[PDB]
């Protein structure tokens, strides 16, 4: 039958309801005026319940602006309200319907994208929807202005072009910006094993260049680390890529150890017999970072399971990894130095005995042999992981902290361990205990600040002051930053390069005392 008796009431519900005149009112009005009936009382129903809420808002908003309160507060409030209403009421089906009625969203989308909050709205909408056509198109096009990983790896050509551009940005990032340039690439590579194997093979071929391919090898190892973080075993990848195929025993042994993310006396015994043979396989073959981290957590956490008949075998293989010089005569190991092996293994043995004994005062007893033996780099890493796991226990500072002293030997005597030590203390500078009160927390924080100032004195100055700026802008109270400046200007000698001033002085703007601060600011601005 005729839908007039129902559709006219459907429209009149939206006419005679409180306050609907301002709208789909046109569509329903057309459905009614074509359906006949009483169109004169329709307009009266639209304007009867017109409460004039809009002019009420005019009065109220202009009165808030009369009050001297910032109108940008009103802008933020209205934007937050409407954006939250959108997110609560967003329908992916209707976004795809906007796509269906036309492929490119009309100018309302291109006007919203000018607003940063609406761009973030589209990011949160489309980062979770890898099949909604509107959302996928918006995220991909805004990347052309996150590139969604599903459309990043949907074909070779897109993956390759975004890969090479992102890798160019990583290489441009030097040694700091990779933290932001690598994940967008890495999470793009870490979605499938085929995009994975392709990117790893490309980086392997790129790594053969002696004009910086070492860095591409580094980034490939980092991407493999991330692929492990996504729970995907790239063991056989590194095997068939590297020289594992040159030695099947080392191949199966190492690859099994990497696939588990743990060691074992069996594969370790295989490598021990191989390197005890007259033809030891390449030391590069075992020099893999996660593998050596397995050595660390076997030898320096409490436990693990261990036999004495294999304890020395683990130790000797790690010594061979950390000691032996193989010179390539066109990829030919012809000279094998094993003369700095036995001392390294002896130091590793003694230090691992101490560390797995769960030492404090006994450390100070044999600190002589320790600082004698931290000169070995691998031993320094091992003690670093041991003291990390001891000190990372919740409330390890209420009971002896001598351990923080040992970094002084490490970082001072080993330059490349500056990034680890600071990147250890960034956790320890955020220590918080309800037992050890905020006074003691600030005491430990200031101790760690003195450690970080010393590490700055060794040249690790850009990331120290950058993180100090970040945590002041965040966490770190003004007292801690003032104490930082106190110790710094008490220890650092002029001249002060502008690479250090550019971050140290514009955060020192908060304070003017520790007077040495006045001298520093005057010298560094003049």
């Amino acid at each position: 039958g005729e839908d007039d008796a129902e559709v006219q009431q459907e429209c009149l519900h939206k006419f005679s309801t409180r306050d609907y005149i301002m709208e789909s009112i046109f569509n329903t009005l057309k459905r009614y005026f074509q359906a006949g009936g009483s169109p004169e009382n329709v307009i009266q129903l639209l304007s009867e319940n017109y409460t004039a809420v809009a002019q009420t808002v005019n009065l109220l908003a202009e009165w808030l602006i009369q009050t001297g309160v910032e109108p940008v507060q009103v802008q933020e409030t209205v934007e937050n309200h409407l954006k939250s209403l959108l997110i609560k009421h967003f329908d992916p089906r209707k976004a795809d319907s906007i796509f269906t009625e036309e492929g490119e969203t009309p100018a309302w989308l291109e006007q919203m994208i000018a607003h940063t909050t609406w761009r973030d709205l589209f990011y949160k909408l489309a980062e979770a929807h890898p099949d909604c056509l509107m959302l996928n198109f918006t995220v991909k096009l805004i990347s052309d202005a996150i590139t969604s990983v599903s459309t990043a790896c949907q074909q070779l050509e897109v993956f390759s072009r975004v890969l090479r551009t992102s890798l160019a940005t990583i290489l441009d990032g030097g040694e700091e910006n990779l933290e932001k340039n690598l994940p967008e690439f890495a999470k793009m590579v870490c979605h499938g094993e085929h995009t994975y194997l392709f990117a790893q093979a490309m980086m392997s071929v790129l790594a053969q260049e002696e004009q910086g391919g070492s860095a591409v090898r580094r980034i490939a190892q980092e991407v493999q680390r991330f692929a492990q973080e996504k729970g995907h075993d790239a063991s056989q990848i590194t095997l068939a890529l590297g020289t594992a195929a040159s030695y099947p025993r080392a191949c199966q042994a190492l690859g099994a150890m990497l696939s588990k993310g743990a060691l074992n006396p069996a594969d370790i015994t295989v490598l021990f017999k191989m390197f005890t043979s007259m033809d030891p396989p390449p030391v590069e073959l075992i020099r893999v970072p996660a593998f050596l981290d397995l050595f660390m957590q076997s030898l320096f956490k409490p436990g693990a399971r261990i036999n004495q008949d294999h304890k020395h075998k683990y130790i000797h293989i790690l010594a061979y990894a950390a000691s032996v010089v193989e010179t390539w005569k066109k990829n030919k190991r012809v000279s094998i130095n094993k003369d700095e092996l036995k001392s390294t293994s002896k130091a590793v043995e003694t230090v691992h005995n101490l560390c797995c004994n769960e030492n404090a005062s006994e450390l100070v007893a044999e600190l002589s042999t320790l600082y004698q033996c931290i000169r070995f780099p691998v031993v320094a890493m091992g003690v670093l992981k041991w003291v990390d796991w001891t000190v990372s226990e919740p409330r390890y500072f209420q009971l002896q902290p001598v351990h923080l002293a040992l970094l002084d030997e490490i970082s001072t005597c080993h330059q490349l361990l500056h990034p680890q030590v600071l990147q250890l203390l960034v956790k320890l500078f955020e220590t918080e205990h309800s037992q050890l009160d905020v006074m003691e927390q600030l005491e430990l924080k200031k101790t760690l600040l003195d450690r970080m100032v010393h590490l700055l004195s060794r040249g690790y100055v850009l990331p120290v002051v950058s993180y100090i700026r970040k945590c002041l802008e965040k966490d770190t109270d003004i007292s801690l930053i003032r104490y930082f400046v106190t110790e710094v200007l008490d220890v650092i000698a002029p001249p002060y390069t502008s690479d250090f001033v550019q971050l140290f002085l514009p955060i020192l703007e908060n304070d003017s005392i520790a007077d040495p601060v006045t001298e520093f600011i005057a010298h560094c601005k003049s």
Partner: protein
């Protein structure tokens, strides 16, 4: 709307009446009564497409922004330099009293009149004259009219005094006898808990002129009735002022200490040493 130079519904129908292009006139009225931000004139069609009319986000921001306007009325009462803050509140008063007739800006202006010690009394006169304002007016608005003229004070204390005598007569004539209790068991502070005298204290607040006014009303009715009820209501009003710790009456009234002593006397029903 015309009080500050904006149109009303009759002007809208004029804009529609006898027009060859009513639709464009309607659109012009809509433009001339919208919220004037440049992001909205594009977003209004887009949000309209959702099934959400423009008035709906207007309602949300309406609630938000008058909540903040009332917050800032209280703030400017308590914030800013004195001359500037009172100038701001009086100017905002002149802006807002044109819409006290509307259902939005009554209590806002009532707070503004609450926080100013004196006002041009035209608006207080309208507050007493109109029953809606007579209800919703803040307590200091009512105080300022009473402090400027005793008409409304007499007009509202007469029914309240009548109700107090109604309570006295009804309680004195009640037919219950027991070993358990009687009607003289409540102490004077027990009897002050009724909303009659507590509301009378709210009507007086901390003002001494209204204290004299209630004193003279109770005096006249006590001189005509020869009944102790109005005396009891004076005592209850004074000790209700003391229950609020009203220093404006308690410290200056020589009778306050003596009535406070008498309160404990009545509480034990004896005058101990």
């Amino acid at each position: 709307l015309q009080d500050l130079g904006v149109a009303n519904g009759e002007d809208l129908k004029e804009t529609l009446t006898n027009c060859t292009e009513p639709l464009k006139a309607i659109e012009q009225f809509q433009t001339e009564n919208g919220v004037l931000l440049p992001s909205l004139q594009s977003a209004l069609p887009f949000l309209d497409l959702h099934g959400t009319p423009r008035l709906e986000f207007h309602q949300s921001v309406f609630d938000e922004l008058r909540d903040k306007l009332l917050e800032r009325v209280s703030a400017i009462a308590s914030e800013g330099k004195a001359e500037e803050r009172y100038k701001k509140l009086e100017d905002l008063l002149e802006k807002s009293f044109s819409l006290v007739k509307m259902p939005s800006l009554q209590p806002v202006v009532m707070c503004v009149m609450k926080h100013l010690p004196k006002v041009p009394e035209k608006k207080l006169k309208l507050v007493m004259a109109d029953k809606e304002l007579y209800r919703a007016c803040a307590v200091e608005v009512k105080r300022q009219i009473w402090q400027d003229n005793q008409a409304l004070f007499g007009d509202e204390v007469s029914p309240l005094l009548k109700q107090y005598i109604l309570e006295k007569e009804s309680a004195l004539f009640s037919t219950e006898l027991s070993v358990l209790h009687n009607f003289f068991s409540p102490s004077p502070k027990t009897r002050r808990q009724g909303e009659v005298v507590q509301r009378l204290t709210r009507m007086v607040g901390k003002n001494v002129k209204l204290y004299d006014m209630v004193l003279q009303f109770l005096r006249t009715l006590f001189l005509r009735t020869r009944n102790v009820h109005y005396c009891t209501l004076r005592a209850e009003l004074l000790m209700s002022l003391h229950d609020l710790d009203v220093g404006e009456i308690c410290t200056v009234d020589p009778c306050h200490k003596f009535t406070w002593c008498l309160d404990a006397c009545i509480r034990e029903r004896f005058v101990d040493s």
